[PDB]
Amino acid sequence: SDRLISIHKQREYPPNSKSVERVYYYVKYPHAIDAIKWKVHQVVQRLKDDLDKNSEPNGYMCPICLTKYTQLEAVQLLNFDRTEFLCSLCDEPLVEDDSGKKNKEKQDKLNRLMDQIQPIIDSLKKIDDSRIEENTFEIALARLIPPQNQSHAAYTYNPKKGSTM
């Protein structure tokens, strides 16, 4: 799902004729690094957007009904005394949320994320300055090391005719 490992659905014909449609696990380097790049960019963008939402003022939340209330809708729900904001349903004096108190906490979380992800961005800086060969199932077999002797998976690839996907 995170595209770190690709799967190959090749079935071969072993000499005992008890063939099964085995799956081959391998890595597609450019697809994997693009997935990693997209994931970290969406992580930092979502954290920045959460920081922006935390930059919004605190607002309110009615503890009886457990519903948030922004500062804009608090003014439409203030009392005749002009002193307290009352809930629409519970008719309870609104208590303040913490949108802004944790804003510095979210920024420090972003800072502690940023130096930890720094080797990843350094690696992507060195990769973006270089050329990545788009490996596939055939390319990955060039640097293959077999793990066990009696391997039922025959790594020899079988091309076919008629497949036009």
Binding site: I64, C65, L66, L89, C90
Partner: protein, 144 residues
């Protein structure tokens, strides 16, 4: 705890609590008994299936069967898919035990109230740490 979400039918003119309320089912009206003012009109007095939420809980499941035009391979595949469900394994075994309760009571010609009492006795005593090592036949016989 939580929102109120409760509607009380109090007469806005008599201002008497508790309100004297007469439910005119025939005329579809809820009226105040003291002054005759209606409170809620168009009141609501088959389409689904009966379900007692004390015997099998809040379990809502439907089975797959042959229709007017039905290919059997689809039915077999769907039955195998529905059988391979992990979240209702406890529900599956308590339903199997309820089926065994009904089979033992029917073989004994016990009445329906005995089956209901034995089923609720199994359900209340189900999944108890003090009752874990006993055989299924023991739970069967003791619930009966």
């Amino acid at each position: 705890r939580g929102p109120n979400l409760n509607i009380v039918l109090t007469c806005p003119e008599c201002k008497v609590y508790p309100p004297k309320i007469v439910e005119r089912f025939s005329e579809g009206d809820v009226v105040c008994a003291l002054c005759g003012l209606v409170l809620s009109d168009k009141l609501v007095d088959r389409v689904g299936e009966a379900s007692n939420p004390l015997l099998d809980g809040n379990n809502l499941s439907t089975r797959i069967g042959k229709g007017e035009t039905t290919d059997m391979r689809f039915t077999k595949e769907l039955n195998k898919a529905q059988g391979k469900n992990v979240m209702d394994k406890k529900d599956n075994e308590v339903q199997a035990a309820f089926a065994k309760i009904t089979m033992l009571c029917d073989a004994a010609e016990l009445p329906k109230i005995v089956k209901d009492c034995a089923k609720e006795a199994y359900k209340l005593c189900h999944d108890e740490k003090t009752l874990k090592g006993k055989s299924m036949e023991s739970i069967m016989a003791a619930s009966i």
